[PDB]
Ligand SMILES: *C(=O)CCCCCCCCCCCCC
């Protein structure tokens with residue numbers, strides 16, 4: 001309203017910028033030609049001629065002013081008809097893209113810990129300490145360590161968690177009785193390692209941590225105690241005993257490091273009062289140290305549990321000793337083998353996951369998998385029906401970052417008005433973009449409408465908040481379907497009820513021929529994809545009609561099967577009772593359906609899923625959506641009766657969190673504490689994986705009870721095969737008939 | 746090479762599409778009028794079916810359409 | 818038939834239009850475009 | 859398939875040849891050449 005020099009200059013700048021001098025209305029010296037078909041009504045005299053250009057593009061109407069966006073507004077991408085050719089839709093991007101784009105990382109992990117107790121004294125099975133899962137080779141390496149470290153810093157900040165975590169557990173080993181007290185009220189406590197004094201100390205003396213009594217006095221030690229003498233747990237200590245001797249010192253280049261640990265535990269399991277609780281912390285529980293420990297202190301204490309509190313990706317585990325009595329017998333059990341094995345099984349998962357992330361302070365290149373790539377245009381003229389560069393670059397960009405975000409901004413320089421349009425290019429886009437045969441256009445109307453200045457772009461690998469427990473589960477199948485569809489022999493696959501916009505195209509090898517279907521119309525211009533490879537069918541699969549002429553050797557009903565039973569207002573068992581047989585007829589060898597049945601427990605989640613028992617039904621977010629369910633057993637036999645020869649199996653979000661390259665891989669924060677929620681939300685809704693191509697199992701107990709010998713029978717013609725049953729993403733039973741190593745019993 | 750008559754076809758084909766111009770804009774599909782001069786080029790050399798006979802057709806700045814273009 | 822205005826040079830409900838076949842100009846387009854191998858080249 | 863060498867720019871048993879139909883280029887020489895009286899002139 002009140003033009004300011006900064007503004008006038010930003011207009012006189014925009015005017016000077018090379019462009020096309022409007023040509024609709026030619027200039028006169030005594031007359032202003034005004035469009036007849038225009039709001040302007042000529043005054044009177046001889047100064048206004050009603051000249052009409054041959055084709056004026058403007059129509060009339062106004063525009064209500066909208067205030068400046070406080071933050072970069074994301075823009076859902078809706079496609080147009082014309083599509084640019086990969087070649088042209090590439091340089092178009094590379095002519096206006098911000099290539100070596102500097103980007104902030106933020107924090108990918110913000111949640112608590114994902115603690116996991118393990119009773120070593122608990123398991124009654126002896127397990128040769130010589131043959132445990134020894135530290136994996138790669139572990140100590142420039143590449144692996146680099147990542148193990150990178151991940152560490154990518155965690156918004158840790159002992160406050162870890163330490164507290166160990167005490168949350170240590171509070172369970174407390175025996176109040178006189179018969180044999182353990183951490184009995186006012187027990188003395190030794191503590192080694194402090195930075196001022198550990199924050200947990202305040203709490204122990206406060207009795208703050210529920211379950212654990214308030215200790216009489218706490219005696220600190222370590223290398224920087226600042227309140228107690230400085231001891232070196234490697235060698236001998238000149239102090240007295242304590243009920244609880246919580247040791248948390250670090251070990252760090254492997255053999256002497258083992259000696260360091262074996263020694264430290266030796267003196268920590270020395271400072272404990274007879275019948276106390278030593279809590280050492282090993283850094284590398286190698287099957288080299290697990291022989292020395294179970295040999296030297298094979299007596300020293302009564303119980304023993306590994307308490308690995310995964311705050312960040314490291315293999316340092318905590319060990320607690322039961323009763324510091326001289327004649328104990330802490331034998332290495334199969335528990336240890338499993339515990340230890342689960343640990344590593346996760347570092348491969350957590351490492352493989354972090355590979356998708358760039359190293360801090362490195363200019364963004366095209367190399368980084370999670371790199372944020374944008375396209376800054378200057379006063380871009382996004383036009384519909386024209387392949388003008390500004391609108392041509394818009395194509396590529398959105399094509400290079402579809403399943404992601406795509407945030408567009410407009411900062412007003414006192415010169416022109418730049419408009420970057422970034423997005424988190426991940427590996428989930430590289431998979432999708434590859435399947436694209438052409439780069440479709442985007443309805444630039446929404447962009448042309450804006451006309452308001454937003455805040456400057458940010459370019460940050462991760463968003464700020466931890467994804468919803470529901471997403472931790474969903475991105476737990478996008479990794480599962482990804483690994484299943486990656487199988488060669490799979491051939492042609494269809495998706496019963498893909499999203500309005502095929503979200504499965506990213507989770508499939510760019511070569512497999514898939515055909516997503518949904519009642520609503522597909523969001524992506526189905527034309528840009530090669531017809532032979534990708535097909536799209538509209539209308540629901542719930543209706544008998546839809547199944548005419550649709551033959552795929554494998555179907556996947558993930559995220560839909562539950563909504564169909566609810567939509568068609570039908571019983572869950574009865575629904576799949578009509579769907580499975582259709583997939584059989586559709587010519588299907590494999591099946592994957594995100595059915596929602598309580599196979600683990602009928603127990604529910606307080607805020608995520610309510611299990612109404614009067615009527616078999618769920619309540620995701622209590623109300624937001626209600627979908628009927630089935631029972632593990634009834635639904636199990638109903639499907640076995642449908643496909644008698646087919647082999648069934650339940651895949652569910654495995655605690656190894658190996659699916660991670662889908663949450664940390666796309667650039668989303670999370671809570672290491674929620675992994676537990678989702679591994680419990682995944683149990684409420686497993687993915688029943690059928691396979692008509694093989695003989696099904698035979699369990700003699702049927703509703704198999706824990707701790708009872710059961711008969712399982714795999715019908716394979718060749719005796720020369722290797723049986724390897726694995727639960728939780730960790731193998732537990734492996735070996736040809738003769739020898740079978742079993743950690744499950 | 747795009748001999749005189751073979752341009753008659755691709756022009757006659759595109760001509761029948763340009764006709765529908767008013768319906769392409771109305772419905773935001775299309776992408777502007779398709780000029781056949783967007784798929785060709787102005788190279789020059791000898792144009793025949795085989796080195797031997799192509800030697801007798803020296804054409805200068807003829808109008809050829811490259812394979813990848815003959816695709817679009 | 819609601820008025821448009823510029824999208825296309827003619828309004829349908831526009832002033833003085835006129836449906837009127839003439840045996841002279843049999844309406845339109847181009848269907849028989851030749852593309853057969855020998856004839857397209 | 860015995861090696862030739864120059865008669866023609868390609869050996870049949872030559873290195874890295876490749877039979878591979880593409881729905882895109884339907885193989886065709888020139889059969890429908892028009893020669894009928896009116897059309898040839
Ligand atoms: C407004 O749309 C009222 C309906 C008048 C025309 C609708 C279509 C019928 C006439 C066709 C005109 C164009 C060629 C038939």
Ligand SMILES: *C(=O)CCCCCCCCCCCCC
Nearest residue numbers: 859860861862869870871872877
């Ligand atoms: C040597 O002549 C061994 C035979 C190999 C080719 C003989 C003819 C069969 C293949 C035809 C190639 C040319 C077009 C069919």
